[PDB]
Amino acid sequence: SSPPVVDTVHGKVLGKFVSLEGFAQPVAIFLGIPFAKPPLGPLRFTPPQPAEPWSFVKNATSYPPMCTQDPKAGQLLSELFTNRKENIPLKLSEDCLYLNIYTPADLTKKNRLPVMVWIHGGGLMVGAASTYDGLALAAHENVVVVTIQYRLGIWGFFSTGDEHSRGNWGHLDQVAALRWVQDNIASFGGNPGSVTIFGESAGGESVSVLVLSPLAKNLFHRAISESGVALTSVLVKKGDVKPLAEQIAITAGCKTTTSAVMVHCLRQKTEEELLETTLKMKFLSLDLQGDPRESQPLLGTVIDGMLLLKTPEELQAERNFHTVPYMVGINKQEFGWLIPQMLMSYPLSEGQLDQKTAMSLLWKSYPLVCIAKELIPEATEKYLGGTDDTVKKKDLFLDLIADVMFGVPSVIVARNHRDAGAPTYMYEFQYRPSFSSDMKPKTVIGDHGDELFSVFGAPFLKEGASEEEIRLSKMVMKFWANFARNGNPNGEGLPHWPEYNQKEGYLQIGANTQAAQKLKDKEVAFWTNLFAK
Ligand SMILES: *[C@@](O)(c1ccc(Cl)c(Cl)c1)C(F)(F)F
Ligand SMILES: [Mg+2]
DSSP states (O other), X not given: OOOOEEEETTEEEEOEEEOOTTOSSOEEEEEEEEOSOOOOXXXXXXXXXXXXXXXXXXXXXXXXXXXXXXXXXXXXXXXXXXXXXXXXXXXXXXXXXEEEXXXXXXXXXXXXXEEEEEEOXXXXXXXXXXXXOOHHXXXXXXXXXEEEOOOOHHHHHOXXXXXXXXXXXXXXXXXXXXXXXXXXXXXXXXXXXXXXXXXXXXXXXXXXXXXXXXXXXXXXXXXXXESOOXXXXXXXXXXXXHHHHHHHHHHHXXXXXXXXXXXXXXXXXXXXXXXXXXXXXXXTSOOOSSOGGGOOOOOOBOOXXXXXXXXXXXXXXXXOSOOOOEEEEEETBTTSSIIIIIXXXXXXXXXXXXXXXXXHHHHHTHHHHOOOGGGHHHHHHHHHTTOOOHHHHHHHXXXXXXXXXXXXXXXXXXXXXXXXXXXXXXXXXXXXXXTSOTTSOTTOXXXXXXXXXXXXTGGGTSSOOOHHXXXXXXXXXXXXXXXHHHSSOOOTTXXXXXXXXXXXXXXXXXXXXXXXXXXXXXXXXXXXXXXXX
């Protein structure tokens, strides 16, 4: 039947129908809609500008390029995280400010469905919207799914610390995409007055940053951070960002005479030269050469004065953030496998860890955990000191890193959000998907990213899910879309999910799903005391 054609502010777009067996209404899919002007040439390291209007009908049936990034790490992460049966290879380009739309609405009728805007993870250095197929979630839960892209790495986050390159270009792109959704999603059957932003890892940190940003006012109405938050420190630069900028400029062949000189020089480099620079910097890899206090594993969020006016901690203390319903979740083993072993090349192949090697490694982990050298012994002893079994010590070390990067920051964010009067919900996800890499030990459960397969309905798109895994995905999708509808995940036939209030109820999600109380309470107390120094 006739492919769907939709009028947007800037012109008409042509999509395609895709049926999911068992659902009468095919899903209308629109791939590669631009939400900004391509940030090329002089527009590099500047805020996104509106897309230019087009005559006639734009064909939105091909996946867009992904933003320039390490193609090997980008393809690997896509393969590890995709919910599709086969991973789709993607082109690289600086021309990447696109979004993809999956709408289950019958576009010949009138519809105002809740909108779910996905912000992908990747450390702010890698990733793509097209990795995530919105078909199953859209059809199963009657929501419009929008997957967005945003500038990454040098292109998205290069900052001189001053007005010549403030930084946070990729977060400004996320804001631009949400403004586009406000202005256009009703033409796709979506309700611009019910937009939920959700994301995982750096995407969850981005959601948290948008909750803290005045630029995102009135652009969304619920938020979900999965395994990432603004207090995940490795993603937020405090203090002097000039050394990293100078290192990047020097690696690219640029002089560092002034900030304006550095930025102008970098704007003259080709995409290929800046990718060469990216690869020479060896981001996302644990840096084992030199003082770990000088390690820079990624270019990330800064306090730029436009998107973020103060540090997340200061904004939280001032209660200066958007008090929307907010779901904050973590996985049982955030540092269990994928980040250390696939993304960061951790020296941990051997599977036993003695306490001296653990202390040395935790010092090398400074860019991730920020533990002063004098505090390494106490932190290591707290986690590892209770056993002499060095296999158990390795597992407990992985727990330590997971608590510092994800668990404690997540609970602190949730507590501060709750204390501003906003409806707050928390979860801890514990499941080992059958879609896990064959390289992943069978004992790793609730690894970073494991909930994605449930959220995005992989059991309905990939082969070989058990019946338990199918049930888990339907329940998770319903909770998520109930939250998008109502700011409360609860509903008929679902386990009760208590609000994260003074009792600190949270939902343990897995093969058995049930409410629990006080997530990470002792750990928060320990690490808050330790970091108070
Ligand atoms: C996520 O975006 C992420 C990667 C690396 C690091 Cl250090 C952090 Cl804090 C988050 C993802 F890549 F998805 F794992
Ligand atoms: Mg070094």
